Amino acid sequence: VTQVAQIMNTNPVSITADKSLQAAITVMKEKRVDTLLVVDEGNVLKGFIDVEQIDLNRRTATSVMDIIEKNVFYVYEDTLLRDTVQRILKRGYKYIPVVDKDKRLVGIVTRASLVDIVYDSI
Amino acid sequence: DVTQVAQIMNTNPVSITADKSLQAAITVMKEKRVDTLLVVDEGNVLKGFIDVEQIDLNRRTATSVMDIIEKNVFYVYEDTLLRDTVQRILKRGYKYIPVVDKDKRLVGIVTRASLVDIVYDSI
Ligand SMILES: Nc1ncnc2c1ncn2[C@@H]1O[C@@H]2COP(=O)(O)O[C@H]3[C@@H](O)[C@H](n4cnc5c(N)ncnc54)O[C@@H]3COP(=O)(O)O[C@H]2[C@H]1O
Q1: What is the Cα A29 distance to its own chain's centre?
Q2: Which residues in chain B are contacts of A28 at CB distance < 8 A?
């Protein structure tokens, strides 16, 4: 039935991995998010960074790459919703980033995507 | 060391009261972009919380917010040391932590986006 592209939120907060921690937290505070999704010049999703990793490696870390986690679970645009929801609800994932066939960052399914979904079913 | 929660907590936590319907609740949740509502009475005293989850499960046989409230809330007072409440979210897996004044009145919560603030101050 329904795909993720339908309900996903089309404004996932990204930063490039050339940018400093000073700059990364700057965005994170403005945008009200505990992570950043890492993305290259052409917007191919590459990893994520944590607020914690910023805090553990702050003294000897100058940049976003210095602390990047490249093993992100993303899910393609046209995947079935049920699966990604099932992952977040039960398998503990905090949100699931959404890409296109070129692995370009295109959306996020946050817990407030579950609201959207539950709101619609009334 | 000696910094409190009140200093940092974000002072707009999303409440609802126990009369409101599920239709009413999920409305507030969507607007505000939040997976849970905190439950407060006429005089704003913290009582519990409801989820997207429970709203989703009990939809068919549940008209009111009270029908599915979770009365057992971890909460903390305004003047608790930040350090303890922060250490709870981080390594004890609490999703966020509601802060009350000494009359158990919701005055704030401490989100994962309260940590950024902390980490931002430290630089
Ligand atoms: N009664 C209430 N009053 C006030 N707030 C309430 C509340 N009940 C629940 N919440 C908050 O709702 C937020 C929504 O969770 P969600 O997974 O959509 O949203 C999460 C997370 O999925 C999202 N996020 C993280 N990295 C992101 C990125 N790179 N792009 C977009 N979103 C990101 O940022 C949000 C930050 O988590 P946080 O715990 O700060 O914020 C949570 C939680 O603290």
Answers
A1: 15
A2: 113, 116, 119-120
